[PDB]
Enzyme design. Structure first.
Site, PDB file in Angstrom:
ATOM      1  N   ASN A  90      -1.630   7.098   6.223  1.00 28.52           N
ATOM      2  CA  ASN A  90      -0.992   6.120   7.075  1.00 28.52           C
ATOM      3  C   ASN A  90       0.516   6.113   6.781  1.00 28.52           C
ATOM      4  O   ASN A  90       1.312   5.518   7.514  1.00 28.52           O
ATOM      5  CB  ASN A  90      -1.651   4.738   6.864  1.00 28.52           C
ATOM      6  CG  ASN A  90      -1.169   3.707   7.866  1.00 28.52           C
ATOM      7  OD1 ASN A  90      -1.316   3.887   9.077  1.00 28.52           O
ATOM      8  ND2 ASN A  90      -0.588   2.614   7.364  1.00 28.52           N
TER       9      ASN A  90
ATOM     10  N   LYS B 211       0.796  -1.230   0.000  1.00 25.38           N
ATOM     11  CA  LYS B 211       0.000   0.000   0.000  1.00 25.38           C
ATOM     12  C   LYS B 211       0.835   1.289   0.000  1.00 25.38           C
ATOM     13  O   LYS B 211       0.434   2.251  -0.630  1.00 25.38           O
ATOM     14  CB  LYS B 211      -1.115   0.020   1.079  1.00 25.38           C
ATOM     15  CG  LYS B 211      -0.662  -0.111   2.512  1.00 25.38           C
ATOM     16  CD  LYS B 211      -1.883  -0.214   3.485  1.00 25.38           C
ATOM     17  CE  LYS B 211      -1.379  -0.360   4.898  1.00 25.38           C
ATOM     18  NZ  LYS B 211      -0.759  -1.714   5.066  1.00 25.38           N
TER      19      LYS B 211
ATOM     20  N   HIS C  88      -2.388  -8.212  12.060  1.00 18.77           N
ATOM     21  CA  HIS C  88      -3.139  -7.500  13.112  1.00 18.77           C
ATOM     22  C   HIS C  88      -4.130  -8.389  13.854  1.00 18.77           C
ATOM     23  O   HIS C  88      -5.157  -7.911  14.319  1.00 18.77           O
ATOM     24  CB  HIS C  88      -3.854  -6.277  12.516  1.00 18.77           C
ATOM     25  CG  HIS C  88      -2.924  -5.331  11.822  1.00 18.77           C
ATOM     26  ND1 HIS C  88      -1.853  -4.761  12.470  1.00 18.77           N
ATOM     27  CD2 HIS C  88      -2.915  -4.846  10.562  1.00 18.77           C
ATOM     28  CE1 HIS C  88      -1.212  -3.970  11.626  1.00 18.77           C
ATOM     29  NE2 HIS C  88      -1.825  -4.010  10.459  1.00 18.77           N
TER      30      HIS C  88
HETATM   31  O1  LIG Z   1       6.455   0.021  12.729  1.00 15.11           O
HETATM   32  C1  LIG Z   1       6.299  -1.202  12.956  1.00 15.11           C
HETATM   33  O2  LIG Z   1       7.230  -1.990  13.225  1.00 15.11           O
HETATM   34  C2  LIG Z   1       4.953  -1.854  12.872  1.00 15.11           C
HETATM   35  C3  LIG Z   1       3.843  -0.908  12.485  1.00 15.11           C
HETATM   36  C4  LIG Z   1       2.596  -1.546  13.100  1.00 15.11           C
HETATM   37  N1  LIG Z   1       1.525  -0.589  13.179  1.00 15.11           N
HETATM   38  C5  LIG Z   1       0.423  -0.806  13.889  1.00 15.11           C
HETATM   39  O3  LIG Z   1       0.154  -1.890  14.392  1.00 15.11           O
HETATM   40  C6  LIG Z   1      -0.482   0.383  14.015  1.00 15.11           C
HETATM   41  C7  LIG Z   1      -1.863   0.264  13.914  1.00 15.11           C
HETATM   42  C8  LIG Z   1      -2.661   1.399  14.015  1.00 15.11           C
HETATM   43  C9  LIG Z   1      -2.089   2.651  14.202  1.00 15.11           C
HETATM   44  C10 LIG Z   1      -0.709   2.762  14.290  1.00 15.11           C
HETATM   45  C11 LIG Z   1      -0.061   4.103  14.512  1.00 15.11           C
HETATM   46  O4  LIG Z   1       0.593   4.089  15.784  1.00 15.11           O
HETATM   47  C12 LIG Z   1      -0.026   4.646  16.879  1.00 15.11           C
HETATM   48  C13 LIG Z   1      -0.519   5.941  16.790  1.00 15.11           C
HETATM   49  C14 LIG Z   1      -1.131   6.522  17.887  1.00 15.11           C
HETATM   50  C15 LIG Z   1      -1.273   5.810  19.067  1.00 15.11           C
HETATM   51  C16 LIG Z   1      -0.794   4.512  19.156  1.00 15.11           C
HETATM   52  C17 LIG Z   1      -0.916   3.709  20.431  1.00 15.11           C
HETATM   53  C18 LIG Z   1      -1.871   4.138  21.542  1.00 15.11           C
HETATM   54  S1  LIG Z   1      -3.045   5.460  21.445  1.00 15.11           S
HETATM   55  C19 LIG Z   1      -3.508   5.038  23.093  1.00 15.11           C
HETATM   56  O5  LIG Z   1      -4.415   5.670  23.729  1.00 15.11           O
HETATM   57  N2  LIG Z   1      -2.900   4.007  23.728  1.00 15.11           N
HETATM   58  C20 LIG Z   1      -1.988   3.504  22.878  1.00 15.11           C
HETATM   59  O6  LIG Z   1      -1.253   2.506  23.220  1.00 15.11           O
HETATM   60  C21 LIG Z   1      -0.159   3.928  18.065  1.00 15.11           C
HETATM   61  C22 LIG Z   1       0.095   1.633  14.199  1.00 15.11           C
HETATM   62  C23 LIG Z   1       2.213  -2.769  12.316  1.00 15.11           C
HETATM   63  O7  LIG Z   1       1.688  -2.611  11.186  1.00 15.11           O
HETATM   64  O8  LIG Z   1       2.436  -3.881  12.847  1.00 15.11           O
END
Ligand SMILES: O=C(O)CC[C@@H](NC(=O)c1cccc(COc2cccc(/C=C3\SC(=O)NC3=O)c2)c1)C(=O)O
Ligand SMILES: O=S([O-])[O-]
Ligand SMILES: [Cl-]
Length: 434
Positions: A138, A115, A183
């Site tokens: 994103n 993506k 996820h």
């Molecule tokens: O970078 C990596 O290694 C992995 C990236 C990897 N991302 C996610 O899982 C992911 C899914 C949704 C959103 C995000 C953006 O990342 C954020 C942004 C803001 C808050 C948080 C965590 C929050 S908010 C809260 O209130 N309590 C929390 O723990 C994480 C990341 C994944 O794809 O596995």
């Protein structure tokens, strides 16, 4: 939408949370912010006048709200949010706020792999046509940071999480590139629940672009792309590959800087979206020839002394690692780094790529042990990626490849996959020359 007078609560700080705070403040609404993390990113960037609550959700604030703006990082199914939903309190995310305001067409891209590449490519196709384009979501900027009256086209990378909280997207062209297990820690109803979140992207889209080779990308009248079949597809000619639209050759992939089948199908998907968005085909093809690829995406960070060191830190799921390994040519031994937070994924699909005499695994992070179990006899396990690198480096011989394609999120040990890729590249440079 008009938010004046409303009690707004934003869940989650960070660049995106901050873009939401700034969005409301610029509209004369002071929101309140909460984050379940004791010490969230960008807390210090939050203006003093904005009330905040950290280390948990505050149910007093949530139940008092007129509108809750939820980061993609907090589950809708969190008990505090489902309580608010039951009470009829409106819950949206940043993407929803953006869609309600945007004044140019939106190309919307989701999928388990590809993506960011496709999003960036379509952005480059727009730039080549001289269109004023905002690219993010994103990736890159949070979408609300792109909003600009002079923008003529938006190209948004959207996650399944962002899509769960979005109801007003009417994309000019939307795609799910593929759906492979990811996820699962956030989808306790499994693959179909994850898929359903992505299927939201097609609702009210003018053109839907689907993957002819992945049935889960299809709604439950779309344009399709695929390898051997589809409106957009590949035509193989004696060790030559062409992009074709409905029988017509449009590009010999020797003119592309990207290589590999899945990058050719990314290019088809990008062209399909760009066509549907009304971009001239000619400039879109030109963009395909100039695009070099993204950092951390199967990126050669060092080729020296007969060894290629490849940073594929953006492989945060099994399907992405599979795309790196499938058809991979290695002259000598592949030294594969796997590890981190596997998000309860089944790593089994990787095993078929790991046979033979010319593979070694170096497994680290939270799920290192489960990864080493794919083939214990050729695996080593360490706590960290640095330990794994220093373990493998003495064993590297001319002809070998060292590949970081970890199949997992980095978040147990790193800020993000970029930090993991950057550390890998630093260590590759140290360990990969005399
Ligand atoms: O970078 C990596 O290694 C992995 C990236 C990897 N991302 C996610 O899982 C992911 C899914 C949704 C959103 C995000 C953006 O990342 C954020 C942004 C803001 C808050 C948080 C965590 C929050 S908010 C809260 O209130 N309590 C929390 O723990 C994480 C990341 C994944 O794809 O596995
Ligand atoms: O705000 S985002 O960068 O997590
Ligand atoms: Cl809580």
């Amino acid at each position: 939408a008009d938010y004046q007078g409303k009690n707004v609560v934003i869940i989650g700080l960070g660049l995106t949370g901050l873009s939401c705070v700034d969005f409301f403040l610029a509209r004369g609404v002071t929101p309140r912010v909460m984050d379940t993390r004791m010490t969230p990113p960008g807390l210090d960037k939050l203006p003093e006048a904005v009330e905040r609550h950290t280390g948990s959700l505050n149910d007093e604030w949530l139940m008092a709200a007129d509108l809750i703006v939820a980061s993609p990082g907090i589950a809708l199914a969190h008990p505090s949010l489902s309580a608010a939903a039951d009470a009829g309190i409106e819950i949206v995310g940043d993407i929803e706020l953006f869609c309600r305001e945007a004044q140019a067409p939106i190309v919307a891209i989701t999928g388990s792999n590809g993506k960011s590449t496709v999003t960036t490519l379509v952005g480059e196709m727009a730039k080549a046509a001289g269109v004023n384009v905002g690219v993010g979501g994103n990736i890159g900027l949070p979408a609300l940071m792109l909003l600009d009256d002079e923008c003529e086209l938006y190209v948004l990378e959207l996650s399944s999480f962002q899509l769960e909280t979005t109801s007003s997207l009417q994309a000019v062209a939307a795609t799910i590139l593929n759906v492979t297990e990811d996820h699962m820690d956030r989808y306790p109803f499994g693959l179909q629940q994850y898929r359903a979140a992505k299927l939201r992207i097609y609702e009210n889209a003018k053109v839907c672009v689907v993957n002819a080779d992945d049935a889960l990308t299809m709604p439950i009248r779309c344009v399709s792309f695929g390898v051997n079949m589809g409106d957009y597809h590949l035509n193989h000619q004696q060790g030559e590959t062409w992009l074709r639209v409905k029988g017509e050759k449009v590009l010999n992939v020797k003119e592309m800087k990207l290589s590999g089948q899945h990058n050719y199908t990314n290019a088809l998907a990008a062209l399909a979206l760009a066509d549907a968005a009304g971009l001239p085909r000619a400039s879109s093809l030109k963009a395909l020839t100039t695009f070099t690829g993204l950092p951390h995406r199967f990126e050669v960070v060092l080729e020296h002394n007969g060894v290629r060191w490849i940073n594929d830190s953006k492989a945060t799921n099994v399907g992405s690692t599979e795309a790196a390994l499938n058809g991979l040519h290695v002259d000598g031994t592949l030294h594969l780094l796997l590890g981190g937070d596997g998000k309860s994924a089944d790593f089994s699909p990787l095993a078929r790529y790991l046979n033979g005499d010319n593979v070694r695994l170096y497994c680290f992070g939270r799920d290192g042990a489960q990864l080493a179990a794919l083939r214990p006899e050729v695996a080593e396990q360490t706590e960290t990626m640095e330990q794994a690198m220093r373990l493998l480096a003495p064993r590297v011989q001319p002809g070998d490849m060292v590949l970081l394609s970890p199949a997992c999120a980095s978040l147990d040990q790193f800020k993000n996959f970029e930090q993991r890729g950057n550390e890998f590249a630093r260590l590759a440079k140290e360990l990969g020359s005399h």
